[PDB]
């Protein structure tokens, strides 16, 4: 069922973590659907005040390894990625 992936199919493989350069990345693993378009967004410290999902990688698909890595960022503060129903805060400095 390759499509917009179900909100329960991705799993925290790696909560939002510094990409290794300056941006931030996360890792998610799938649970059924072949390469699917995962609904990734991000809020600020659990608050949907402003979508902090400025995706350095604005097209995450979940393949046999899951979504791989997703890049996101915003000016310093608390960025948490909300992959459908998946959520996890990260303080980016």
Quick structural summary:
The protein is mainly beta and 93 residues long. The protein has one domain (1-93): Immunoglobulin-like.
What is the CATH architecture term? Sandwich
Number of E-type strands: 8
Our count of domains comes out at 1
Shape: globular
Give the terminus-to-terminus CA distance. 39 Å
Secondary structure tally, helices: 0
Describe this structure in words.
With 93 residues, the chain is mainly β. The protein has a single domain, classed as Immunoglobulin-like. The protein has strands at residues 11-18, 24-29, 36-37, 40-44, 61-62, 68-72, 77-83, 86-92. The strands form three sheets. Strands 1-2-6 form a three-stranded antiparallel beta sheet, with no helix packed on it. The chain starts with 10 loop residues before the first strand and ends with a strand. The PDB classes it as viral protein. The entry lists the keywords Viral Protein. It forms a monomeric assembly. NMR solution structure of domain III of E-protein of tick-borne Langat flavivirus (no RDC restraints). The protein: Major envelope protein E.
Task: Supply database-style keywords.
3-stranded antiparallel beta sheet; 8 strands; Immunoglobulin-like; viral protein; monomer; Envelope protein E; mainly beta; about 90 residues
């Amino acid at each position: 069922t390759y499509t917009v992936c179900d909100k329960t199919k991705f799993t925290w493989k790696r909560a939002p973590t510094d990409s290794g350069h300056d941006t931030v990345v996360m890792e998610v693993g799938f649970s059924g659907t072949r390469p699917c378009r995962i609904p990734v967004r991000a809020v600020a410290h659990g608050v949907p005040e402003v979508n902090v999902a400025m995706l350095i990688t604005p097209n995450p698909t979940m393949e046999n390894n899951g979504g791989g890595f997703i890049e996101m960022q915003l000016p310093p503060g608390d960025n948490i990625i909300y992959v459908g129903d998946l959520n996890h805060q990260w303080f980016q400095k």
